[PDB]
Amino acid sequence: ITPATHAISINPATGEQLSVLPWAGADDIENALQLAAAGFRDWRETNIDYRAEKLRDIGKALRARSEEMAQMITREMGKPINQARAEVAKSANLCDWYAEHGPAMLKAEPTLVENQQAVIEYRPLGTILAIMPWNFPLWQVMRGAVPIILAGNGYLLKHAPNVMGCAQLIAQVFKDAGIPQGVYGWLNADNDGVSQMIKDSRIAAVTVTGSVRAGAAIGAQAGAALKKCVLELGGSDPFIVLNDADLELAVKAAVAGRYQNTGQVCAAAKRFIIEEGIASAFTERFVAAAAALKMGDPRDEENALGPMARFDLRDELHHQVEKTLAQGARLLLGGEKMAGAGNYYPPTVLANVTPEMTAFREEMFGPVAAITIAKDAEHALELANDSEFGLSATIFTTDETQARQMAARLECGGVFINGYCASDARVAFGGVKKSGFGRELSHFGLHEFCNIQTVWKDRI
Amino acid sequence: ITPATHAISINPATGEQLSVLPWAGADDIENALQLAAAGFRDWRETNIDYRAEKLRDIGKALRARSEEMAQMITREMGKPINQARAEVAKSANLCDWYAEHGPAMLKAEPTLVENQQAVIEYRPLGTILAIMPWNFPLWQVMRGAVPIILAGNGYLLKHAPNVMGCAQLIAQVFKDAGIPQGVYGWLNADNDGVSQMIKDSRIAAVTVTGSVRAGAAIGAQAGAALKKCVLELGGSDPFIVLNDADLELAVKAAVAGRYQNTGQVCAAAKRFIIEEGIASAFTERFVAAAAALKMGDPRDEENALGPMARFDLRDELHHQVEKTLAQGARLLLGGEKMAGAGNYYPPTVLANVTPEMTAFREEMFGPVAAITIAKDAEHALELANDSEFGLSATIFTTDETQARQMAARLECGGVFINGYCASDARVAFGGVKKSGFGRELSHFGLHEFCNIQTVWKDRI
Ligand SMILES: NC(=O)c1ccc[n+]([C@@H]2O[C@H](COP(=O)([O-])OP(=O)(O)OC[C@H]3O[C@@H](n4cnc5c(N)ncnc54)[C@H](O)[C@@H]3O)[C@@H](O)[C@H]2O)c1
Ligand SMILES: NC(=O)c1ccc[n+]([C@@H]2O[C@H](COP(=O)([O-])OP(=O)(O)OC[C@H]3O[C@@H](n4cnc5c(N)ncnc54)[C@H](O)[C@@H]3O)[C@@H](O)[C@H]2O)c1
């Protein structure tokens, strides 16, 4: 059985095949679209406070299967089990947060028009097709599904083909919570099935979290079909350390930022850009700290890293490492595939990385840190912006004025000053350039898939 | 000299050729992109209060050329001169309105993160490519250029090829205002030139106002190049009149909404949907009121209608009329091309228009009213939503509770209850379905082309 006919799960820690699922056929797609249309037709007529209570029911149902869900995430894509538990906890908390704060964000807006003639209303658009990746099989889905559904939309999930066990368990959680199947639904569609759905009148808009190549392929189809899209396409985030930085905190945040989820994070710290005076001190401490990370069986809580999720992607990452070394970089740690049946790649550090090199210009979606030396803060900003990507960034410096000035000139959607980069319900998430466009979380994720409707009475 | 090599202006009132302009070549396009990039680089570093003052300077420069601008609009596309003067006045007022209210819309936004650690900032995105139409040759440009430039972006205009006299005069106004080189620019690009610019890294995003066909062609290219777009496309707005309406006001608003700018308005009232009990009285009054509209030389202020802008589009509109009559509609007024050198089409009314007919399913972009009988309010809503378009809508009824319930169920971006549909800086503008996506004016038009950036300090 090959991906020509089936979605396939393999445990990356052992190489064992776990499950197969054939692609949806024509009747499957038509049935999914009929369900979603009928579900949205009814859901859009519910009251906002009823939907807020249903979000709480989702959170309860998810917590009641928290360990079942975490084990499935770890089994299918290799995440350390405590990181999978944290992903569940964050996803369930998102349900409660939007239940509490979401309704107010959807209230009608007053305008400056006289006599209170005109208000802005947030109406639902319809069924939103969501194309999602494997690195956070639960959180990526919930990050969009929770606000999208609270706004009165429907959500139709096309999950990554290596995590359909996760997809089926998520569907069970929504069923446990009483969400209609025509409001949260899912389909094991192949790429042609996605193309067919984008063209169908029962899909109102599209959201994509994935590679740059996937976003360009889907975004072109959404545009041709006159469907709005949001694209979140990963990153090559710079992590800038200046001479006056809190060095020990910078190293802690650098290691956490690069090696979380075995490096497989869109907003991971990927390009370390260090002012020349502090570069030796940072580099030696970073290598020693990265070397302290244990790697192995992700069911063993002693391990900070598991295997990488996909065997072919470990091969690609190692090729990127070899090309960067051939171009002139120095290997300071790791940098070889581990022998054995599991898909393991050790924490790896490359130094003397210049902007011409593979590890500076491509997304390194695994546990490989690139370290580049900057002449001064202006050079560091130039190096940080010298990227096709633009998702987020970190700056470590005790000069808070300078940090604020650099943040204003960084070409990315998030800037973390002297701390740990992360997504959070309370703030906007999303980038610029080839990292995509559109924003998720806070009120942005609620409004992206609304029909923002002016209602104006007595304009005479 | 054919459209294969040149943009051509022809006076629609007389048929005489006014000007020709060859398409931009490869060097012209490259030059404009280099200057846009350099202009944006410097402009994004200016202070918001400085850019607000420059918006006031634009308004002063525009008012200083107000009659010259109005006469150019009338000469190139046929609009009654007092409507051209109103377009200039509304456009200059927009500059002052955004100068006054825009800066507060771009101030950092607090979040619920503890201890005031995180804010949302509104950063410039880059140079925005703008593809614009001929029906409001000044207002369509200013509606976007003013907020786009205020937010620190650049603006690169590709105007419709029959209004390049207007385009050159607008550029003179921005030059008179002292707007720096590259912050406002324009190109006489053919469709291939637009394609080349969308793929170029010096264009950050795209905004399109035009036909559904143009939006789908350009939106597909923007998606493939990973560029955000805002699409403001056609409309076929319904105008619903229920039995309990203020009939005299409904007729006045119906005639104004259909026949403004000789019918050539995206959000014109195009499909009149009249409850059966009041249909006879509405129809007889509407015909009488439309018949009272004078048509002729648009330099003469007695004329409520001018010629249509484009000879080929009058031919298209009359073909749509003839098809609708052949399908079974009845002609109540007008419905024939006027003889002579001018491009005149009289105020026209079609009755017994059913949902299967051309004038119900296509945008009627000229002075042709379609009247459809609804059995009751629920049928009227069904008829109103039975369209590929979804820009805006009007409801006339003294039952305000029913009007607001219907508004919530109308698939469009603006609903006017018992009044006159129009765009206004203080409210959102834009639609759903094949009318496109994204919103203009108010804070929406300011924020659509910002990089919405989280800045978070001390996340530890
Ligand atoms: N969070 C993220 O932004 C993210 C996640 C995973 C991978 N990536 C990047 O992509 C690289 C490859 O990873 P992947 O191979 O897992 O990513 P991908 O982009 O192939 O997959 C993400 C989703 O898009 C779907 N998809 C891809 N191409 C499609 C198409 N043409 N039509 C319809 N659906 C399509 C996939 O089935 C999956 O659901 C990674 O190495 C990393 O660089 C980024
Ligand atoms: N929603 C709105 O805000 C709004 C406002 C005004 C007009 N409109 C629509 O404008 C339409 C009439 O305008 P037009 O007659 O200028 O229509 P059009 O779509 O032919 O052209 C509009 C612009 O698009 C450009 N264009 C068209 N096809 C293109 C392509 N393939 N590549 C690049 N550029 C391309 C044209 O040169 C022109 O600049 C009507 O549908 C009206 O509703 C919409």
Residue numbers in the entry:
A (entry chain B), B (entry chain A): 3 to 462
Copy text from the publication:
The NAD(P)+-dependent succinate semialdehyde dehydrogenase (SSADH) Sad is a member of the ALDH superfamily and oxidizes succinate semialdehyde (SSA) to succinate. In microorganisms, SSADHs operate in the degradation of various nitrogen-containing compounds such as putrescine or arginine, where they prevent the accumulation of the toxic SSA intermediate. Our results show that Sad is a surprisingly flexible enzyme that is not only able to detoxify succinate semialdehyde and glutarate semialdehyde but can also functionally substitute erythrose 4-phosphate dehydrogenase in pyridoxal 5′-phosphate (PLP) biosynthesis and glyceraldehyde 3-phosphate dehydrogenase (as well as phosphoglycerate kinase) in glycolysis under physiological conditions. We show that Sad, which primarily functions in the detoxification of succinate semialdehyde in various degradation pathways, does not only accept closely related substrates, but also converts phosphorylated sugars as a side reactivity.
To understand the molecular basis of the improved enzyme activity in the Q262R variant, we solved the crystal structures of both Sad WT and Q262R variants with bound NAD+, as well as in complex with both NAD+ and SSA. Even more surprisingly, when testing the substrate spectrum of Sad, we noticed that the WT enzyme was able to directly accept E4P, notably at four-fold higher activity (50 nmol min−1 mg−1) compared to D-erythrose. Moreover, in the Q262R variant, E4P dehydrogenase activity was increased 17-fold compared to the WT, reaching 800 nmol min−1 mg−1. Both variants were also active with glyceraldehyde 3-phosphate (GAP), showing even higher activities with GAP compared to E4P. GabD showed higher activity on SSA than any of the two Sad variants (164 ± 9 μmol min−1 mg−1) but was almost inactive with E4P and GAP, indicating that the promiscuity with phosphorylated C3 and C4 sugars was restricted to Sad. Compared to Sad WT, GabD only supported slow growth, likely due to its lower activity on E4P as well as the rather unfavorable intracellular NADP+/NADPH ratio to operate the oxidation reaction.
